[PDB]
């Protein structure tokens, strides 16, 4: 469909200032660009954008109370520096299924001191040598990785 | 002498095959490197071999 109509539908007369969660999976965004988001959304604490032909997160607006994100199934590549400024209080992130070519792209995420878990599956980076360990040495703040902590400690449900 | 040389047109749609004994008959066509390596020895050739 289109993120605009999807959003306007999810907003069953509700103001964009009292919601705590939102989902836009199985939609479409022209040029792989966000469309319809603003800073009006303040109380939002969760987001899910999956398989929407997205390619960059530049347009994403500031969201402080947000603490979980999902961007799988898209083709995002080299837009990670923006996340820090917009959403610095973020803890959970997911990117499995996107175009991540090297560890250089993932360096900015160190500034997300509130980060706990990260999910990278089916990406090119995973096909390297000593990637989990090198990543951990890069992001000491991060504890979980793709659902497994150091020593392969399976993470709980929630 | 081993198997003789072969010919070919530009587009390579046609390809002729000749034996060694007759390479002295079409010397004017073969390339230089293959020609300069053939004339000085034509003397020693009898039918298809080299004395």
């Amino acid at each position: 469909m289109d993120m605009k109509k999807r959003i306007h539908l999810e907003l069953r007369n509700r103001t964009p200032s009292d919601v705590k969660e939102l989902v836009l999976d199985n939609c479409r965004s022209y040029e792989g660009k966000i469309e319809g988001l603003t800073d009006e959304f303040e109380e939002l604490e969760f987001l899910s954008t999956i398989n929407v032909g997205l390619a960059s997160v530049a347009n994403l607006p500031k969201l402080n109370k947000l603490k979980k994100l999902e961007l799988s199934d898209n083709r995002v590549s080299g837009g990670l520096e923006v996340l820090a400024e917009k959403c610095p209080n973020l803890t959970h992130l997911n990117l499995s299924g996107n175009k991540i070519k090297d560890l250089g792209t993932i360096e900015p995420l160190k500034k997300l001191e509130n980060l706990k878990s990260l999910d990278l599956f089916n990406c090119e980076v995973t096909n390297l040598n000593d990637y989990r360990e090198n990543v951990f040495k890069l992001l000491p703040q991060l504890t979980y990785l793709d659902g497994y902590d150091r020593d392969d400690k399976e993470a709980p449900d929630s | 002498l081993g198997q003789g040389i072969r010919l070919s047109n530009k587009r390579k749609t046609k390809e002729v095959i000749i034996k060694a004994e007759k390479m002295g008959k079409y010397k004017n066509l073969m390339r230089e490197e293959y020609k300069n390596l053939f004339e000085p020895l034509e003397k020693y050739i009898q039918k298809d071999v080299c004395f």
Partner: protein, 772 residues
């Protein structure tokens, strides 16, 4: 926006006038088309001349003005003019310009983000290019060619359609707001429309051009041309670069476009079902029609209904002919007598009776035509032109290239004309058993002699001997045919002519509506037979791929998988409108009433009994999770519901859900037992069989009103109900009424209640109740 307000102001200003008001008030909207002609009418005799005479000027072109200002197109860039402020007389909103400005635009003008969409707009021509690139040329040779003229197709096209089917498709892919009522072709071909729409959506484009290109993408260009060699559209599109009257550029083009495979598969299916229905004795007609409508097949990615493809193709075969006749499909005036082909050029006649003695004295009636007639005939690599006269083959000419084919064509021609003494006194070898009636169905002596020839070559030789033989006169030596099929001999057959060079196939753009009998023999407003079931191969075994024989008699599966499939079918049939159905319950979030449906109660016995509770738990869990929020996928509930009938329990769920027949389904991944795709969201594949889900509700995937149209219907107009758009149409309640605008200049009233019944049965039955 402000533009909208401007359009409204313009409409007001225009209505202030009297003539404009009278014309916009009187009559319907169709008058617009007419008005489109009385304006902007101007032609020229020799545009080449006037083009050289105009381009010699300073500003021979017109162009928009605001587009240039917005684009910042200057004037007198480098002492070379591009345009000057003026107003053309016709447009009044355009300004003269020069050709150089176009180059300026192309070089330092505004650039769009992306333009690869073009490859989709003109897919046919990029396909031409690619097909060319995948060719391996060969040597060139010179010689004479036997170029035969005939009607063929030059444009390879998949899913060839009609015009009425195309006009709606364009509107539903580009102008949906202005769309008309949903036609059957749409509801049936949903995935196709979805595909064509996914590409031309949210794009900057000129739409008229796209519509024209789609028309070309669905038009097989039929031409009457000279031809040599094989006949395939892949070649005819570039025939000009393969050979002429005196030269030939050899090249292999066999492995491209995969066309004829589809046709041979179709014909095989037709033969199969024709034989099946022939197995009957009194209802082979209805049996065949049922087998037809109870069958489908895949084309590339999509699944199409058989009866729909049959009415679009033009394969003149004795199988396709019968089918197209049963379905009332009109067709051309082309005959078929066994493997050969025939076409009448001129003449007339009428049936007549005669008899022959098979062995000793055994009278058997056989008919013939009492007049002079002329016929063209085409067998494998052989052509012929002959004439019949009162049960005799008057003359014949041939232009083939083989002796065997020549002899076979001649023999089948002699038979078709009942020429010879055999039709006067049959041979001893034949008997009453070989006569007819494998199981009661009679056989005219014609096809009898046919199979008698196909049996042994010596029967054919004797038949040829039945034709007069004489000594080859001088000069005619070249135009003579022996018994072996030699272009010359010392003694040759009677009334025969040979020549090198095929015969030019005739042509006629005519159509006829024929019928058939209970014995599968078609008639054409006369006692003439165009097709039958005796002119096709006897039988053969084939393994059809990507087909759906959803019919009991035409099925090989066991009662177990069939029971599962029928349970799924019933459970989907409960996907309609009205309370007590699953859509209303989802809307009300009554995820519990689903567990108590009767259909799950009928499919429950099929569940593995030792682990039915655990699976039940999981199923109910998923359902609640999907229903409570609203983010569900209809293709998973229909799959897991049959397990929610029993009571939950405790245990470890491995990940699969087994039935009692060691066949499982997995929740999230497609398998042999239950498959589907986001591309074609209107199908469910169970055990290979396909099932058509109605379009009443749309989940996250479906993203238009197309998925809701099978839930709506027309009703008596009510001015009290509101008028809404095509997007808010989803927020109505099942059983409610609402007014709406459809297509152009038309408003109606709809109700979200369906009617699964069709007209076919309601008419056929009521008719049969009248012949008593």
């Amino acid at each position: 926006m402000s533009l909208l307000l401007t359009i409204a102001k313009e409409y007001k200003r225009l209505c202030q006038d009297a003539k404009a008001a009278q014309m916009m008030t009187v009559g319907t909207v169709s008058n617009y088309t007419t008005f489109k002609k009385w304006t902007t009418s101007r032609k020229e005799k020799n545009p080449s001349l006037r083009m050289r005479w105009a381009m010699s000027s300073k500003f021979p072109i017109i162009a928009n003005k605001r587009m240039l200002e917005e684009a910042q197109i200057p004037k007198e860039h480098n002492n070379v003019a591009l345009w000057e402020d003026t107003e053309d007389v016709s447009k009044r909103d355009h300004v003269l310009a020069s050709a150089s400005c176009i180059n300026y635009w192309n070089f330092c003008g505004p650039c769009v983000n992306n333009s690869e969409v073009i490859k989709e707009v003109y897919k046919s021509r990029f396909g031409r290019l690619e097909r060319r690139k995948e060719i391996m040329w060969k040597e060139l040779r010179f010689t004479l060619v036997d170029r035969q003229r005939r009607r063929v197709d030059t444009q390879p096209v998949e899913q060839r359609l009609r015009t009425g089917e195309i006009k709606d498709l364009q509107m539903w892919t580009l102008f949906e707001d202005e769309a008309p009522l949903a036609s059957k072709f749409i509801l049936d071909n949903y995935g196709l429309v979805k595909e064509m729409r996914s590409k031309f959506a949210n794009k900057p484009l000129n739409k008229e051009v796209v519509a024209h290109m789609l028309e070309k993408q669905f038009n097989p260009e039929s031409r009457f041309l000279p031809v040599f060699g094989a006949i395939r559209p892949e070649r005819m599109e570039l025939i000009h670069a393969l050979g002429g009257e005196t030269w030939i550029q050899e090249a292999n083009t066999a492995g491209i476009s995969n066309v004829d495979q589809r046709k041979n598969d179709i014909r095989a299916v037709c033969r199969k079902v024709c034989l099946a229905a022939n197995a009957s004795i009194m209802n082979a007609k209805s049996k065949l029609v049922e087998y037809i409508k109870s069958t489908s097949m895949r084309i590339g990615e999509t699944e199409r209904k058989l009866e729909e493809l049959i009415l679009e193709t033009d394969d003149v075969s004795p199988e396709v002919t019968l089918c197209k006749s049963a379905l009332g499909g009109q067709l051309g005036k082309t005959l078929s007598f066994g493997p050969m082909l025939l076409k009448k050029i001129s003449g007339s006649g009428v049936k007549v009776k005669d008899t022959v003695y098979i062995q000793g004295v055994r009278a058997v009636q056989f008919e013939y035509w009492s007049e002079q007639e002329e016929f063209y005939g085409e067998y494998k690599s052989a052509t012929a032109l002959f004439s019949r006269k009162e049960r005799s083959l008057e003359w014949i000419t041939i232009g083939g290239g083989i002796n065997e084919d020549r002899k076979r064509l001649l023999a089948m021609c002699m038979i078709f004309c009942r020429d010879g003494d055999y039709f006067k006194d049959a041979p001893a070898t034949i008997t009453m058993a070989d006569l007819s009636t494998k199981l009661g169905r009679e056989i005219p002596y014609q096809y009898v002699m046919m199979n008698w020839i196909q049996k042994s070559e010596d029967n054919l030789e004797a038949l040829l001997y039945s034709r007069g033989i004489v000594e080859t006169n001088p000069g005619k030596m070249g135009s003579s045919m022996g018994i072996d099929g030699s272009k010359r001999a010392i003694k040759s057959l009677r009334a025969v002519t040979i020549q090198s060079g095929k015969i030019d196939m005739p042509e006629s753009k005519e159509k006829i509506h024929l019928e058939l009998s209970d014995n599968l023999e078609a008639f054409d407003s006369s006692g003439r037979i165009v097709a039958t079931i005796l002119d096709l191969p006897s039988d053969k075994k084939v393994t059809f791929q990507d087909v759906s024989f959803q019919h009991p008699d035409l099925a090989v599966l066991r009662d177990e998988k069939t029971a599962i499939t029928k349970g799924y079918e019933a459970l989907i049939k409960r996907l309609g409108t009205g309370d007590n159905d699953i859509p209303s319950l989802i809307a009300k979030k009554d995820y519990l009433s689903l567990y108590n449906l009767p259909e799950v109660k009928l499919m429950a016995p099929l569940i593995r009994p030792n682990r039915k509770g655990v699976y039940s738990r999981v199923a109910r869990k998923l359902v609640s999770t999907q229903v409570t929020t609203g983010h569900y996928s209809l293709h998973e509930l229909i799959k897991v519901l049959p397990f929610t009938y029993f009571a939950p329990k405790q245990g470890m769920f491995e990940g699969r859900l087994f039935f009692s027949n060691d066949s499982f389904v997995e929740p999230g991944v497609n398998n042999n037992v239950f498959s589907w795709s986001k591309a074609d969201s209107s199908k469910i594949y169970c055990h290979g069989i396909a099932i058509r889900v109605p379009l009443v509700v749309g989940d996250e995937h479906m993203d238009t009103s197309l998925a809701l149209l099978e839930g709506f219907s027309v009703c008596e107009n009510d001015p009290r109900a509101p008028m809404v758009t095509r997007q808010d149409l989803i927020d109505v309640g099942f059983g409610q009424k609402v007014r709406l605008f459809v297509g152009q200049g038309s408003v109606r009233t709809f109700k979200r209640t369906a009617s699964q019944r069709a007209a076919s049965s309601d008419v056929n039955k009521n008719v049969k109740k009248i012949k008593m």
